[PDB]
């Protein structure tokens, strides 16, 4: 149900995908890992993409 501004998905996906600079379909696969909880899904994504920063340490 698109609310002409933020779908039930886009209220997490567009907030997530803009905060993580990824593609909207990637937010959709870290949200589906955390029952579309944007806080839990952000820690999991920062555990997969940002959790490997030590590649120069």
Curated annotation (Swiss-Prot):
Protein name: Defective in cullin neddylation protein 1
Purpose: Required for neddylation of cullin components of SCF-type E3 ubiquitin ligase complexes. Neddylation of cullins play an essential role in the regulation of SCF-type complexes activity. Does not act by preventing deneddylation, but rather facilitates neddylation, possibly by acting with HRT1/RBX1 to recruit the Nedd8-charged E2 UBC12 to the cullin component of SCF-type complexes.
Domain of life assignment: Eukaryota
Organism: Saccharomyces cerevisiae (strain ATCC 204508 / S288c) (Baker's yeast)
Domain UBA-like: 9-46
Residues annotated as transmembrane: none
Residue pairs linked by disulfide bridges in the UniProt entry: none
Assembly and binders: Interacts with the cullin CDC53. Interacts with ubiquitin via its UBA-like domain. Interacts with RUB1/NEDD8.
Residues recorded with modification Phosphoserine: 7
């Amino acid at each position: 149900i698109k609310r002409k501004d933020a779908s039930p998905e886009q209220e997490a996906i567009e907030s997530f995908t803009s905060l993580t600079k990824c593609d909207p379909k990637v937010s959709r696969k870290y949200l589906q890992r955390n029952h579309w909880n944007i806080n839990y899904a952000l820690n999991d994504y920062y555990d997969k993409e940002i959790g490997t920063f030590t590649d120069e340490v």
